[PDB]
């Protein structure tokens, strides 16, 4: 509920900022501090994942054939690949969000920017429904920031 709202806030803003290059300075939700720290963390670690795995991201996007809202409302397969062994950690969660940013950039390229928001929902959706129990035990997005603190 609040975990969903916060996760959606963070993932929606990262994907929009990655696709447009413009920071959304409109105010945050109730938990502004945690979400702003999580977004700053994604700007570091998420951008690096895209740089390292650009070829593999291109191949997976090519295999998924994402081009519309229906394709956007169906990020399985990525959920298979990032959690094929079924193990959950913050690095794999980051990699899922990083691929979402990679798809959002492509949606901007083919003039489908309206699909970026439903992309953030389905990624947030499959993340929270599948890993809720794990996300709560790791103290949510504060544990995310503290893990990647550096
Ligand atoms: S990397 O080494 O910087 O980050 C990283 C670490 N371990 C595994 C992965 N996995 C992936 O990038 C895979 C490959 C293609 C793809 C598409 C969507 C989600 C995940 C992945 C990366």
Author numbering: 172 to 321
The study reports:
Aryl-fluorosulfates are mild electrophiles that are very stable in biological media and in vivo and can efficiently react with the side chains of Lys, Tyr, or His residues, when properly juxtaposed by a high-affinity ligand. We report here that a fragment library of aryl-fluorosulfates, when deployed with proper biophysical screening strategies, can identify initial covalent fragments. The hMcl-1(172–323) construct retained its binding ability for pro-apoptotic proteins and it has been extensively studied to characterize the interaction of hMcl-1 with potential drug candidates. ,,,− Based on our previous experience with covalent agents, we observed that covalent compounds could cause very large denaturation thermal shifts, often with double-digit degrees Celsius, compared to reversible agents.
In addition, the contiguous electron density between the compound and His 224 Nε that corresponds to the expected imidazole sulfamate moiety can be clearly observed. Our screening approach resulted in the initial fragment hit 2 whose binding geometry as determined by X-ray crystallography is novel with respect to the several hMcl-1 antagonists reported to date, that almost invariably anchor around an electrostatic interaction with Arg 263 and an acid residue (mimicking a critical Asp acid in the BH3 peptides). Chemical shift perturbations studies mapping the changes in backbone [15N, 1H] correlations of hMcl-1(172–323) in the presence of fragment hit 2, also revealed that the compound likely binds to the BH3 binding region, closer to His 224 than other binding site nucleophilic residues His 252, or Lys 234. With fragment hit 2, accordingly, which induces the largest ΔT m, hence likely the most effective under the chosen experimental conditions, we observed nearly 100% 1:1 covalent complex formation via MS analysis.
